[PDB]
mmCIF file of N, CA and C and ligand atoms in Angstrom:
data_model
loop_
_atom_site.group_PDB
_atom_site.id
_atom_site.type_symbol
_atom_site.label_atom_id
_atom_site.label_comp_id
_atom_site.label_asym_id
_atom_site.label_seq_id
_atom_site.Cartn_x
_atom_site.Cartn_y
_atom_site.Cartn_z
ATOM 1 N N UNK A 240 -12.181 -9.193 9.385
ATOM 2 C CA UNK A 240 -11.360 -10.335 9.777
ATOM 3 C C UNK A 240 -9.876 -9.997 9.700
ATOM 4 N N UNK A 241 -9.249 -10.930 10.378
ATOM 5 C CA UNK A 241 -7.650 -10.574 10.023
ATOM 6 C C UNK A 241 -6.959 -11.727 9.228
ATOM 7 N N UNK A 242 -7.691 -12.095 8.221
ATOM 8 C CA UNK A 242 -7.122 -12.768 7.243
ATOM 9 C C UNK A 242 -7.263 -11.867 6.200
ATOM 10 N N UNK A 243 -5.973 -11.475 5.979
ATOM 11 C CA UNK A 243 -6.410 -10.837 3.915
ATOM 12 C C UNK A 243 -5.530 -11.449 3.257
ATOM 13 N N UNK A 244 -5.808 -13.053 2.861
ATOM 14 C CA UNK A 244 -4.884 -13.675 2.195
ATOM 15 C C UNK A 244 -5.947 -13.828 0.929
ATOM 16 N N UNK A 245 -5.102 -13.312 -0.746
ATOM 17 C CA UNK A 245 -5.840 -13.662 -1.460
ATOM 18 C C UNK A 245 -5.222 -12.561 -2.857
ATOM 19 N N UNK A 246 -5.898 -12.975 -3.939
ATOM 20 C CA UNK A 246 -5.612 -12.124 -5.001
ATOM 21 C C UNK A 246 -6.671 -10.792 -4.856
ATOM 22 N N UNK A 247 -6.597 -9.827 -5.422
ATOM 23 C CA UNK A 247 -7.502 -8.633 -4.826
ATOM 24 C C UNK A 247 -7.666 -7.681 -5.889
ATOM 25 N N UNK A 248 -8.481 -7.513 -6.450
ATOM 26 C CA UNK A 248 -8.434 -6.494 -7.777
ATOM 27 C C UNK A 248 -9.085 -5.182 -7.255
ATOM 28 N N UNK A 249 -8.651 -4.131 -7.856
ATOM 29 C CA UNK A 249 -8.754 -2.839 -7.870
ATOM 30 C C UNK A 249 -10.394 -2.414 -7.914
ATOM 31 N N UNK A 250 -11.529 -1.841 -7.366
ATOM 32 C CA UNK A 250 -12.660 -1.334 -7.624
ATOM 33 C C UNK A 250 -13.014 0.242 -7.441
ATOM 34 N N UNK A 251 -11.947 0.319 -6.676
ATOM 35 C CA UNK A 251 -12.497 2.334 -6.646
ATOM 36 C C UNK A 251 -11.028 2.987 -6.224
ATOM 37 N N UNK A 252 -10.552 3.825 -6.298
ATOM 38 C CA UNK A 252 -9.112 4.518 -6.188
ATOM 39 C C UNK A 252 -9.584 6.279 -5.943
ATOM 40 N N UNK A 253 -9.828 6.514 -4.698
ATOM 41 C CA UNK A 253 -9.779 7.806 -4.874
ATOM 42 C C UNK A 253 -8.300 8.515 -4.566
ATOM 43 N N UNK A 254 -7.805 10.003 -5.292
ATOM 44 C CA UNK A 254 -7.070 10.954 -4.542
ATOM 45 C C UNK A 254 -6.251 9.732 -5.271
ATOM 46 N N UNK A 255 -5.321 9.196 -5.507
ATOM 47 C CA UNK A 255 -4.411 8.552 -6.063
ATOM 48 C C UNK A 255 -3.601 9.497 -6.692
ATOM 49 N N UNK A 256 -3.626 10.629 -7.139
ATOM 50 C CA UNK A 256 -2.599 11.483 -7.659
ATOM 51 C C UNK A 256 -2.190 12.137 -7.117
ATOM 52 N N UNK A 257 -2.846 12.710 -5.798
ATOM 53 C CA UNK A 257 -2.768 13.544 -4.584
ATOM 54 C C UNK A 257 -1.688 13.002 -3.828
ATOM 55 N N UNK A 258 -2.431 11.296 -3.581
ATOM 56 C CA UNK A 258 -1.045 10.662 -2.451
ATOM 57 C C UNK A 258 0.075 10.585 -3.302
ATOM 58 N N UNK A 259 0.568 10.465 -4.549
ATOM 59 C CA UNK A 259 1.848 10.211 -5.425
ATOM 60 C C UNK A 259 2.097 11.394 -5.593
ATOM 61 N N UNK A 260 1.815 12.490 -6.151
ATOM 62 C CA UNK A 260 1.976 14.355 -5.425
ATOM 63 C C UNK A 260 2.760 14.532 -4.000
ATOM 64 N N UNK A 261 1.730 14.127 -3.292
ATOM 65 C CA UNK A 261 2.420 14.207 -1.730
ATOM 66 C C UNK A 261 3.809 13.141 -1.571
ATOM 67 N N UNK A 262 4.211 12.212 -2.471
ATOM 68 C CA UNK A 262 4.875 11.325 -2.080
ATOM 69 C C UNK A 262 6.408 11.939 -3.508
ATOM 70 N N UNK A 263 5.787 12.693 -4.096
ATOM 71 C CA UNK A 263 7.234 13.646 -5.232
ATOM 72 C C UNK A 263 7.157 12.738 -6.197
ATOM 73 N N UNK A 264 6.292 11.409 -6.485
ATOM 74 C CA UNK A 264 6.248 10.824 -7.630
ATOM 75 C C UNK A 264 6.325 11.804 -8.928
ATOM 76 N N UNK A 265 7.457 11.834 -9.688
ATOM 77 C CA UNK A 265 7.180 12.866 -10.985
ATOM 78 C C UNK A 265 5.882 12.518 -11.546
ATOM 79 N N UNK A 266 5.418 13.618 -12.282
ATOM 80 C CA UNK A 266 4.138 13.829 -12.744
ATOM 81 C C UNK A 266 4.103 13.063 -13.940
ATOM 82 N N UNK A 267 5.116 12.727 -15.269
ATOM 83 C CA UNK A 267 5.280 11.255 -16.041
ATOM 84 C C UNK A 267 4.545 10.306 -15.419
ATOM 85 N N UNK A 268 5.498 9.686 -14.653
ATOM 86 C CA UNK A 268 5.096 8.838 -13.699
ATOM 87 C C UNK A 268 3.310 8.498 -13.332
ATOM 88 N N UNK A 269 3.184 9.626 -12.664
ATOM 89 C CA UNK A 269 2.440 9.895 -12.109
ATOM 90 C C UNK A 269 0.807 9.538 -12.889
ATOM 91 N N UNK A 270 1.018 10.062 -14.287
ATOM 92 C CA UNK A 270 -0.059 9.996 -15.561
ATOM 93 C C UNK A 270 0.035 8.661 -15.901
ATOM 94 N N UNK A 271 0.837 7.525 -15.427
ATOM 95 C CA UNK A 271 1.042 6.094 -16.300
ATOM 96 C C UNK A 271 0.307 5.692 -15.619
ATOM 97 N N UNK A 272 0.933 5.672 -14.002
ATOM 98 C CA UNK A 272 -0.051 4.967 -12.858
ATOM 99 C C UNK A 272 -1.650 4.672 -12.811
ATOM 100 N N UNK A 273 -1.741 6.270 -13.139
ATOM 101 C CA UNK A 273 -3.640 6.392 -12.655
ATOM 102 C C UNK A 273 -4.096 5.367 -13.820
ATOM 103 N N UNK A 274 -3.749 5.071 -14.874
ATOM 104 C CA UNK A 274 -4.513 4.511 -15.889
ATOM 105 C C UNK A 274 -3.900 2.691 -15.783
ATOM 106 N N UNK A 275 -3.362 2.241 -14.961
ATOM 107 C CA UNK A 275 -2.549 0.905 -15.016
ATOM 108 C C UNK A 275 -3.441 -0.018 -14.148
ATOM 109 N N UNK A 276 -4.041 -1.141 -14.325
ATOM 110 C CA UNK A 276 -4.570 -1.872 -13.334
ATOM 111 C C UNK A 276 -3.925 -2.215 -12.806
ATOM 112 N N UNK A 277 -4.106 -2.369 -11.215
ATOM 113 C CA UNK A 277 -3.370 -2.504 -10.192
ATOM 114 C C UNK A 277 -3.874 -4.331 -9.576
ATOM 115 N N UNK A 278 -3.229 -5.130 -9.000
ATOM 116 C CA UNK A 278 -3.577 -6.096 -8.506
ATOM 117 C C UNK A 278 -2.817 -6.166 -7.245
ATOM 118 N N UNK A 279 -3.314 -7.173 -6.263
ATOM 119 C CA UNK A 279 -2.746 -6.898 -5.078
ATOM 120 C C UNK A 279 -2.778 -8.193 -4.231
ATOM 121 N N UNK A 280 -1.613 -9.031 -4.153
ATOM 122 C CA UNK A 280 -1.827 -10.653 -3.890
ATOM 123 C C UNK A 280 -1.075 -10.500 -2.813
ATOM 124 N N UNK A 281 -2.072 -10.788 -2.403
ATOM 125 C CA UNK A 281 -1.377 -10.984 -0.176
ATOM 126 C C UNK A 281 -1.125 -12.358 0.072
ATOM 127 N N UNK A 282 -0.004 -12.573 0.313
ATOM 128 C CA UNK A 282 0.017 -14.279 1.434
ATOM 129 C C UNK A 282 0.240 -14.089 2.912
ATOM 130 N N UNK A 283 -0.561 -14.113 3.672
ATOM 131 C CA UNK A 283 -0.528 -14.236 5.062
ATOM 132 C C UNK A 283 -0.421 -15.614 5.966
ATOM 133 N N UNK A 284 0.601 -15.732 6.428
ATOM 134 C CA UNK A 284 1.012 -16.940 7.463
ATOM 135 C C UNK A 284 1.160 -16.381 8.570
ATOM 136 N N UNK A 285 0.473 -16.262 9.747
ATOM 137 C CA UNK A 285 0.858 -15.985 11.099
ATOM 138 C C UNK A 285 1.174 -14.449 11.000
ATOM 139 N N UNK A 286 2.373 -14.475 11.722
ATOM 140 C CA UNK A 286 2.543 -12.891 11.483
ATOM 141 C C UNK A 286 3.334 -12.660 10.112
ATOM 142 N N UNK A 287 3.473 -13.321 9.485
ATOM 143 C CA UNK A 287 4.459 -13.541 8.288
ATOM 144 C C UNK A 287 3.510 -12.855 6.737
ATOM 145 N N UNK A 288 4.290 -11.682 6.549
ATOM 146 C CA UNK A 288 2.786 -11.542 5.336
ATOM 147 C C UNK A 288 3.897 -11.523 4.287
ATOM 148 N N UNK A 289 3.825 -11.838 2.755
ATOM 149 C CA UNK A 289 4.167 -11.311 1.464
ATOM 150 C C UNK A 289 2.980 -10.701 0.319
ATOM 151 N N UNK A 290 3.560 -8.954 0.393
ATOM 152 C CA UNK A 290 2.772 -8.175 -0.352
ATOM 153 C C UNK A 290 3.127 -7.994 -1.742
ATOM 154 N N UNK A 291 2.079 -8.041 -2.876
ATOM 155 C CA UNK A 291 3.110 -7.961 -3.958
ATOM 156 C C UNK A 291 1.952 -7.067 -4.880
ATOM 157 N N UNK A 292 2.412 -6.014 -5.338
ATOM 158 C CA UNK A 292 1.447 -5.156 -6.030
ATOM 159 C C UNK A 292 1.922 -5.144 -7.699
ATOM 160 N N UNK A 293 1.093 -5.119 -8.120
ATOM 161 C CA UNK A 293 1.573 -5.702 -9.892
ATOM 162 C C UNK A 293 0.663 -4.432 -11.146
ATOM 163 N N UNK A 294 1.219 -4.176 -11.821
ATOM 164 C CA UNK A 294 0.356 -3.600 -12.910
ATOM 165 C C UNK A 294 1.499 -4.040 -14.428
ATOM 166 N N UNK A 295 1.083 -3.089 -15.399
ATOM 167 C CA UNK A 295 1.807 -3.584 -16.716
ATOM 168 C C UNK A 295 3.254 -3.360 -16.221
ATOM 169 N N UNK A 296 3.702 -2.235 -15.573
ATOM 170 C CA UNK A 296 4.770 -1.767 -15.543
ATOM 171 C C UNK A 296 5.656 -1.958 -14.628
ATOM 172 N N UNK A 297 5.166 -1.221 -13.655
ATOM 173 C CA UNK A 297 5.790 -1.140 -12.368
ATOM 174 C C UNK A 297 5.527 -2.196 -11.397
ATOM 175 N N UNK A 298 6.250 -3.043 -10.551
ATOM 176 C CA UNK A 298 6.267 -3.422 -9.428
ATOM 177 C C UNK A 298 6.454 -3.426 -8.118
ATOM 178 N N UNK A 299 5.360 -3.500 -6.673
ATOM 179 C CA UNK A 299 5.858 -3.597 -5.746
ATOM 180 C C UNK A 299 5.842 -4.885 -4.795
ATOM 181 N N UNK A 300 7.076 -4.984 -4.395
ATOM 182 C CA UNK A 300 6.573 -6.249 -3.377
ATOM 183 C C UNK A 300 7.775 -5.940 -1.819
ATOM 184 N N UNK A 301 6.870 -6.353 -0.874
ATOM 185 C CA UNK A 301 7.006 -5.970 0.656
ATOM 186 C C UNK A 301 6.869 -7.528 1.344
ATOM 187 N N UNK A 302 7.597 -7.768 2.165
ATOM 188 C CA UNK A 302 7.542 -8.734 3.247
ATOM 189 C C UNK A 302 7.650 -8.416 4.433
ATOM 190 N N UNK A 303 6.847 -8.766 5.382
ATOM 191 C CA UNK A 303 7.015 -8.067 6.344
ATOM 192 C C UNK A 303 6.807 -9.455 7.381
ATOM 193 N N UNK A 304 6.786 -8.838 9.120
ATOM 194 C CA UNK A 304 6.489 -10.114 10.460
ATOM 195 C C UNK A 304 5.804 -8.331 11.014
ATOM 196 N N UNK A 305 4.185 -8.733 11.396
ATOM 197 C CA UNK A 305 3.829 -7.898 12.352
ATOM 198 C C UNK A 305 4.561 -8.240 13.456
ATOM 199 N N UNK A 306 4.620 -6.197 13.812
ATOM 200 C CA UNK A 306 5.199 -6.040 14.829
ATOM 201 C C UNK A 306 6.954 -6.188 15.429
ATOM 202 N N UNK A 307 7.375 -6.459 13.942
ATOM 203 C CA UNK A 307 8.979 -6.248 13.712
ATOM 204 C C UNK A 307 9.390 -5.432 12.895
ATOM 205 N N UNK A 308 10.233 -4.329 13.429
ATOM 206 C CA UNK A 308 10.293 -3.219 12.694
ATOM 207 C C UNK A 308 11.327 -3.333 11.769
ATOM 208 N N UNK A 309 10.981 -2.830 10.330
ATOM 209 C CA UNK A 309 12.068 -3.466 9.536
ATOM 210 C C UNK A 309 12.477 -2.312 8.387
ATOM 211 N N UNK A 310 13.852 -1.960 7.851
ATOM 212 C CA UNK A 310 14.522 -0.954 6.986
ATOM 213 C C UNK A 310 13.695 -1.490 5.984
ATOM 214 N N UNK A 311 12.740 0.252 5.039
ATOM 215 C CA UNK A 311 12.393 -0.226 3.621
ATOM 216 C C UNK A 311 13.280 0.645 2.742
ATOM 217 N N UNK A 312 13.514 0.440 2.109
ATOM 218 C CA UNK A 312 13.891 1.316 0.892
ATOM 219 C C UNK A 312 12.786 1.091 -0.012
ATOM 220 N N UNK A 313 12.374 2.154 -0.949
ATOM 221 C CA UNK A 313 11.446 2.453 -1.297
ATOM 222 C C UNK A 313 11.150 2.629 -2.703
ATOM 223 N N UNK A 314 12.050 1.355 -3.778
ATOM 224 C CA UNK A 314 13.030 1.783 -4.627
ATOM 225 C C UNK A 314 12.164 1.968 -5.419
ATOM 226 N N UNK A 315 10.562 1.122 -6.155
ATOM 227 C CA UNK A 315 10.243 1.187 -6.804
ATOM 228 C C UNK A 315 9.094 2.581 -7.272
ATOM 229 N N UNK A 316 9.254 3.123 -5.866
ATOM 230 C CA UNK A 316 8.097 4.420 -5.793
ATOM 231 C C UNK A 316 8.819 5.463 -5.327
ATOM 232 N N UNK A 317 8.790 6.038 -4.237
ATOM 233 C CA UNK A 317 9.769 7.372 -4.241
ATOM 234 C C UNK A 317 11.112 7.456 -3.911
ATOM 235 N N UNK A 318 11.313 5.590 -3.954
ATOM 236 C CA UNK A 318 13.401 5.601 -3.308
ATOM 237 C C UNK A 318 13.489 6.310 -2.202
ATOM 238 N N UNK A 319 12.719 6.067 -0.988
ATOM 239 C CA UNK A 319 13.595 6.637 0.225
ATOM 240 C C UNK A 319 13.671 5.578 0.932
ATOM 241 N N UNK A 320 14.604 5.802 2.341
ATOM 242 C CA UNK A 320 14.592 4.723 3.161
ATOM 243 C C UNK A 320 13.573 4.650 4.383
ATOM 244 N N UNK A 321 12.667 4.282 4.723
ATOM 245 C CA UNK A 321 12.168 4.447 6.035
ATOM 246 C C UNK A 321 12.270 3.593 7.011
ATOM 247 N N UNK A 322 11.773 3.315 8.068
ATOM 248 C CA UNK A 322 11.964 2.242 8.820
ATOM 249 C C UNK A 322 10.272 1.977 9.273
ATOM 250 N N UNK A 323 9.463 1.153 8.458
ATOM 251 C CA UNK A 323 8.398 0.355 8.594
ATOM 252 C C UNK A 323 7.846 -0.418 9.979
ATOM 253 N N UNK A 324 6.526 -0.268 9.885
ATOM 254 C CA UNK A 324 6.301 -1.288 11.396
ATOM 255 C C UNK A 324 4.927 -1.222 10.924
ATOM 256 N N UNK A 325 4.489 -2.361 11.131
ATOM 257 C CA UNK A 325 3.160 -3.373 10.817
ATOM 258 C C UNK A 325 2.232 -3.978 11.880
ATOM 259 N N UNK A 326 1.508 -3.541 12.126
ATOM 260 C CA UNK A 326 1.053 -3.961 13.789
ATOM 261 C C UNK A 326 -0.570 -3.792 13.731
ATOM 262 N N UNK A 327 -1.497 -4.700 14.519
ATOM 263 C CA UNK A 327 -2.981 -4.732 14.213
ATOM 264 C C UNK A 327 -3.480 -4.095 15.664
ATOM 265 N N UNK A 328 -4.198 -3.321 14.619
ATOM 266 C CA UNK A 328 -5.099 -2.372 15.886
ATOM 267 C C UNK A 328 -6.441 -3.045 15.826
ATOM 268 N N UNK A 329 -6.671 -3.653 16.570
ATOM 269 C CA UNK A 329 -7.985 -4.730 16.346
ATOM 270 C C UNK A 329 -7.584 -5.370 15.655
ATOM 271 N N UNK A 330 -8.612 -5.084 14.453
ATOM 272 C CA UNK A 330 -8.785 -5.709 12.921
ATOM 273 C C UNK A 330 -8.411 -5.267 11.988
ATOM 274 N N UNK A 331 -7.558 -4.083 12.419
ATOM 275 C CA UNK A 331 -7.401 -2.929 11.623
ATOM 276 C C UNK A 331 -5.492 -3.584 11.114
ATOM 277 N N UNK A 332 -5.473 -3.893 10.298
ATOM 278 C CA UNK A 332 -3.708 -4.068 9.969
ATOM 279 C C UNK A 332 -3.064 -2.417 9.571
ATOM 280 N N UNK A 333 -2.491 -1.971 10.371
ATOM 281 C CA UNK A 333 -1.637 -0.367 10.489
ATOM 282 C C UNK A 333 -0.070 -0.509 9.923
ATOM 283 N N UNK A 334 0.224 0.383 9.115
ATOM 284 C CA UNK A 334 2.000 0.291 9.075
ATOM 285 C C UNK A 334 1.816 1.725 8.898
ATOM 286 N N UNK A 335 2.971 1.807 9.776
ATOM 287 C CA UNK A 335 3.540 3.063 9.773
ATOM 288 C C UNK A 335 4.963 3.285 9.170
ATOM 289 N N UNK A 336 5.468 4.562 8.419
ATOM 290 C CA UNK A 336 6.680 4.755 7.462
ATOM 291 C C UNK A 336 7.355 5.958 8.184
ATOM 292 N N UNK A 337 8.560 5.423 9.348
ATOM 293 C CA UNK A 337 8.905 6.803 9.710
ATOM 294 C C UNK A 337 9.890 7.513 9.040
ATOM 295 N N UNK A 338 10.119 8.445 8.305
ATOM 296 C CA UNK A 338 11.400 9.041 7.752
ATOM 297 C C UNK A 338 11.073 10.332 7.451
ATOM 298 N N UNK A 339 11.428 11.122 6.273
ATOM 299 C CA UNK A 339 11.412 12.438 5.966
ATOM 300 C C UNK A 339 9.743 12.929 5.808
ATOM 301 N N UNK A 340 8.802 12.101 5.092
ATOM 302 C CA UNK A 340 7.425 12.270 4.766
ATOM 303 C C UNK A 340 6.532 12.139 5.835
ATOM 304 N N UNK A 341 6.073 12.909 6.446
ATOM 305 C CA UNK A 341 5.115 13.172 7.653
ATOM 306 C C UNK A 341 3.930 12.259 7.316
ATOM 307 N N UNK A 342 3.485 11.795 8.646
ATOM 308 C CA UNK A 342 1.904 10.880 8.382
ATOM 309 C C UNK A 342 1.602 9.699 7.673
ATOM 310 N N UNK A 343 3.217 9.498 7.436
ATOM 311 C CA UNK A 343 2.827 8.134 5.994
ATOM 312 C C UNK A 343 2.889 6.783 6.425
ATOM 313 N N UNK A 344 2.192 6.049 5.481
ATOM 314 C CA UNK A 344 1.897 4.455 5.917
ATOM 315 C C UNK A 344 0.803 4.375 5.335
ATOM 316 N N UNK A 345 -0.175 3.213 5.911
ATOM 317 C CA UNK A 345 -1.162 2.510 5.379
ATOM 318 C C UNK A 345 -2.202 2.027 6.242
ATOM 319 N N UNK A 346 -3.382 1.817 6.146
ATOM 320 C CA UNK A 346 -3.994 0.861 6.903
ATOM 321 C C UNK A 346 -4.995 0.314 5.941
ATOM 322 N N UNK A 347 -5.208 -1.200 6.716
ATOM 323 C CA UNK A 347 -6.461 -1.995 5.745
ATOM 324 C C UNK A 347 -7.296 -2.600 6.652
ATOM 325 N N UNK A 348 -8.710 -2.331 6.136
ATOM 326 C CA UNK A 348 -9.816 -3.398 6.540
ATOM 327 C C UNK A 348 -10.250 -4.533 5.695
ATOM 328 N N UNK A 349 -10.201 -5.245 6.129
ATOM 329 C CA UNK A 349 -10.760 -6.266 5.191
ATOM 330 C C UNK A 349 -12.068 -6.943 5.778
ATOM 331 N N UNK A 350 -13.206 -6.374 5.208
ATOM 332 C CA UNK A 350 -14.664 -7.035 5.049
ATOM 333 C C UNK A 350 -15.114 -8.283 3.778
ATOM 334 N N UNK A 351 -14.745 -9.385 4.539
ATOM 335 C CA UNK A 351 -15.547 -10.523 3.650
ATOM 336 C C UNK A 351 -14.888 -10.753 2.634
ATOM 337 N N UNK A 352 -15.292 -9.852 1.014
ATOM 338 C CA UNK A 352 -14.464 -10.401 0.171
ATOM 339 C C UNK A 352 -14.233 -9.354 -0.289
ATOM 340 N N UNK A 353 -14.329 -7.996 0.373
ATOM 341 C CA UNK A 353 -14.013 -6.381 0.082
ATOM 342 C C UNK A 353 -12.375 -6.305 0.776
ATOM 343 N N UNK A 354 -11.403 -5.243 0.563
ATOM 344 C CA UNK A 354 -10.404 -4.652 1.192
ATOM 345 C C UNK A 354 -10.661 -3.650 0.685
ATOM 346 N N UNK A 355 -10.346 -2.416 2.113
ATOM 347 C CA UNK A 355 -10.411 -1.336 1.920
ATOM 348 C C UNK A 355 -8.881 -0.877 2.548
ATOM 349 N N UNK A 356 -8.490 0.023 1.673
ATOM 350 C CA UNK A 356 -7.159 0.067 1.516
ATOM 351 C C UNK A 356 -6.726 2.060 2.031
ATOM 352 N N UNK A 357 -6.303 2.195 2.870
ATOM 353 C CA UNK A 357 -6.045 4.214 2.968
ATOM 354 C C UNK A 357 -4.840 4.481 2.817
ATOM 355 N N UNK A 358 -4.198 4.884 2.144
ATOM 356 C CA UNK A 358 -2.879 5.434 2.446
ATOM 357 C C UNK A 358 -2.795 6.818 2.489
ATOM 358 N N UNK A 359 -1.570 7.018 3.114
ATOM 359 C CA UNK A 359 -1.671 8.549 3.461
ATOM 360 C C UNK A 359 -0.061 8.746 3.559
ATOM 361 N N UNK A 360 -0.378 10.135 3.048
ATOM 362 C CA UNK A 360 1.440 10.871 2.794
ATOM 363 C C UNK A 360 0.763 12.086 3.031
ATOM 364 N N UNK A 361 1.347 13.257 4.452
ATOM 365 C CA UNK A 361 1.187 14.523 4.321
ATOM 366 C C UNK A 361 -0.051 14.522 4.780
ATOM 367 N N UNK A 362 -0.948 15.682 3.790
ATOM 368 C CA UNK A 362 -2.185 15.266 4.331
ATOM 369 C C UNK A 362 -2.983 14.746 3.120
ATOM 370 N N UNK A 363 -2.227 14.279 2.525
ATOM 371 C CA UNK A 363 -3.005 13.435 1.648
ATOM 372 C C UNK A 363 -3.646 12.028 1.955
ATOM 373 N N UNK A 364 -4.791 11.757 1.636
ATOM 374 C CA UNK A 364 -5.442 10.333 2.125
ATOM 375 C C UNK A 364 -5.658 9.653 0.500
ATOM 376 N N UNK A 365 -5.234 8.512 -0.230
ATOM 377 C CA UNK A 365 -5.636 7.988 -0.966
ATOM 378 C C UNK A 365 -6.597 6.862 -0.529
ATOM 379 N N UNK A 366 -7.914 6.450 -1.137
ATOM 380 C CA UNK A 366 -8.797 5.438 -0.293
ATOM 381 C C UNK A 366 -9.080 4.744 -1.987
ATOM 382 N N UNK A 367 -8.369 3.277 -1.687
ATOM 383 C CA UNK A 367 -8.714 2.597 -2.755
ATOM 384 C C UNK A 367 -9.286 1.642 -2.217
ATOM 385 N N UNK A 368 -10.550 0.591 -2.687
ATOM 386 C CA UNK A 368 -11.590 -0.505 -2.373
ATOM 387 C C UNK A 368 -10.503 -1.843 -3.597
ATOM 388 N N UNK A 369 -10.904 -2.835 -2.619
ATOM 389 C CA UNK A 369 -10.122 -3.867 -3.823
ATOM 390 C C UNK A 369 -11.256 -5.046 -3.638
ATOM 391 N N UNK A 370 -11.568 -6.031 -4.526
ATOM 392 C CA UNK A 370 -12.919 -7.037 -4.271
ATOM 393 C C UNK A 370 -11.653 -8.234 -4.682
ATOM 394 N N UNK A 371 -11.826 -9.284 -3.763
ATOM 395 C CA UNK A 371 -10.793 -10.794 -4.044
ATOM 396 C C UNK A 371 -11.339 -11.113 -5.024
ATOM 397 N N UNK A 372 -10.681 -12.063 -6.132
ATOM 398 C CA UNK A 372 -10.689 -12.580 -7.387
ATOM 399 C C UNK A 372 -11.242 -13.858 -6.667
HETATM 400 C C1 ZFJ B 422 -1.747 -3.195 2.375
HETATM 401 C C2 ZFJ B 422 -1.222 -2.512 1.115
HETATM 402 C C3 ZFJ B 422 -0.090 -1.842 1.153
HETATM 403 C C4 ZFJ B 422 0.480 -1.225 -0.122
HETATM 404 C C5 ZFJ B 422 1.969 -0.825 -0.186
HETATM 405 C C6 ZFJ B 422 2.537 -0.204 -1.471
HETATM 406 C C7 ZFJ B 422 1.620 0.016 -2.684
HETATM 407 C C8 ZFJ B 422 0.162 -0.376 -2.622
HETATM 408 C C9 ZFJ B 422 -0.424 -0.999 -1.342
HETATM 409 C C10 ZFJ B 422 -0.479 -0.036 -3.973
HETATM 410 C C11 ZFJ B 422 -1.029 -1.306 -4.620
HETATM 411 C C12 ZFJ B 422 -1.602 0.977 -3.765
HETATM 412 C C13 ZFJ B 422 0.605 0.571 -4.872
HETATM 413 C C14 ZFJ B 422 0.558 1.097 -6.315
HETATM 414 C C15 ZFJ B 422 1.830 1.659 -6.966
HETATM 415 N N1 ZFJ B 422 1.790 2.155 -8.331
HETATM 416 C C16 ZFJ B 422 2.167 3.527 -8.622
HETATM 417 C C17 ZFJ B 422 1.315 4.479 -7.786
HETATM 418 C C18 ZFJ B 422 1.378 1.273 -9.407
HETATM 419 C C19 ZFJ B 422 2.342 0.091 -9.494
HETATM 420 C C20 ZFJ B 422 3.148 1.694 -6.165
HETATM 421 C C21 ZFJ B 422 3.178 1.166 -4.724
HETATM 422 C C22 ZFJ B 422 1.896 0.607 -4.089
#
């Protein structure tokens, strides 16, 4: 479906050190993450989404309008700037991150009350599963 509005908890995380490797996350860093539960609360209105990713520590949160391309800075993960674009291939919600890091962005499926989540930096693929609360 192309609704993924909802709270979303973490169930499987593969390669997660690989994509933060590929992305220059220091390796500190890097050792806090893998062990931090991750949560992931989407609000979707139209094309209007607010992403907000939460654990003990660190925070991310993204707003975006599919299909309007918009400056990210990247402050809370590797601080770069890219220029983002969010756009549905089917059912498929795609963002792409163009700047210095080859191949990077995201895509999600969302089955029922599953999200399946890929990100990719380089040739790294991280594939995390999230189940709605
Ligand atoms: C549709 C989802 C997009 C998206 C963008 C940015 C991040 C994520 C998902 C997470 C939840 C996978 C995530 C986790 C982290 N941490 C360090 C690796 C833990 C806070 C940073 C950025 C994003």
């Amino acid at each position: 479906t192309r609704d993924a509005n909802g709270t979303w908890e973490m169930e499987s995380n593969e390669n997660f050190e690989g994509w933060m490797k590929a992305l220059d996350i220091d390796f500190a860093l890097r050792k806090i993450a893998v062990r931090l539960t991750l949560t992931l609360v989407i609000d979707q209105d139209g094309d209007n989404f607010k992403t907000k990713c939460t654990s003990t520590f660190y925070n991310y949160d993204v707003d975006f309008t599919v299909g309007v391309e918009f400056d990210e800075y990247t402050k809370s993960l590797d601080n770069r700037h890219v220029k983002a674009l969010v756009t549905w291939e089917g059912d498929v919600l795609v963002c792409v991150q163009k700047g210095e890091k080859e191949n990077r962005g995201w895509k999600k499926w969302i089955e029922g009350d599953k999200l399946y989540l890929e990100l990719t930096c380089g040739d790294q693929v991280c594939r995390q599963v999230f189940k709605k609360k």
